[PDB]
């Protein structure tokens, strides 16, 4: 599953992604940690908030 970024988000830890509107995050996994996803952007995997993105269906 891929997601599209709907709202900008700035990483506040090194394991998070910084994401910008329009970007596509690839191969997204829903985490145990509620509200968070893990996925690949610019060839790097990291965590990002689920309410800043929309699942591409």
């Amino acid at each position: 599953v891929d997601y599209i970024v709907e709202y900008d988000y700035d990483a506040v830890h090194d394991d998070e992604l910084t994401i910008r509107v329009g970007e596509i995050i690839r191969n997204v996994k829903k985490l145990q940690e509620e509200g968070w996803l893990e996925g690949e952007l610019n060839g790097r995997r990291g965590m990002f908030p689920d309410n800043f993105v929309k699942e591409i269906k």
């Binding site: 988000y9 506040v12 830890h13 998070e16 940690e33 509200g35 965590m47 908030p49 309410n51 800043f52």
Partner: peptide, 8 residues
């Protein structure tokens, strides 16, 4: 550290 559920 814990992470919040960030708000737009």
């Amino acid at each position: 550290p814990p992470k919040p559920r960030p708000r737009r």
